[PDB]
Amino acid sequence: ADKSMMAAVPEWTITNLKRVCNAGNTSCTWTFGVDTHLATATSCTYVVKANANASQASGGPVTCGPYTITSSWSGQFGPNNGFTTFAVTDFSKKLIVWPAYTDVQVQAGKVVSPNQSYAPANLPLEH
Amino acid sequence: TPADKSMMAAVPEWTITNLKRVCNAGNTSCTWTFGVDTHLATATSCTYVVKANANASQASGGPVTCGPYTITSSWSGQFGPNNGFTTFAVTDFSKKLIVWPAYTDVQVQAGKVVSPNQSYAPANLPLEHHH
């Protein structure tokens, strides 16, 4: 038997996503909004620090409004295809999305356009 | 350029089949076994081993290749240990598609197959095959 874990709600849009890292790459500040389209959007500032290579570091958990956010960077496909995945969880709703951005997309410190939308999945936590 | 873009690919959901975690007695190795069934093709069977000096069940794994897939995993206790959960990242590099199956420790701790099989909608990952 098969069960779809995808929620029957609109995709969540990650708005105006950008990554700004300091000169030494020991701190990267990600800013974005989370717009579920069914409620007021949430604005987030998400800072990842490291002794070296903050852009490769795993971040969080960070709270932003109803969300708990982490991130993980992967160079599994080589540096040219490095990418960061966020895990954005609304614990109250038991919903999770995983926005994922290549370094190519965010390296210039400009906002990613278009905004990217993701379908939430159910996470069967026990409250 | 449009304002917004759905990243969800126009393909059937990938079903993770017969998922099981078995860790050794000292929790220095956990073997996850599961299939990736995209339905568009016959399923791929995978054996995914995560090793650690301690607490392999909490350790990040991969990358491991299984058929066309590259797989990593990360465990999170952000909601407390009773709500620990493992998230996989399963990417088909050639198709530029990725899913993130996620299982709570409660679901897998018995070492028994998770049922029902859980399916996930793939997202597009805009990797550059042409640098």
From Swiss-Prot, chain B:
One of its GO terms (biological process) is effector-mediated perturbation of host innate immune response by symbiont. It comes from the Eukaryota. Keywords: Disulfide bond, Secreted, Signal. One of its GO terms (cellular component) is extracellular region. Induction: Induced during growth on maize and banana roots. Disulfide bonds join C23-C30, C46-C66. The keyword NADP does not apply. It is found in: Secreted. Homodimer. Stimulates salicylic acid signaling in host plant roots. This is Effector TSP1. It comes from Hypocrea virens (strain Gv29-8 / FGSC 10586). The gene is TSP1.
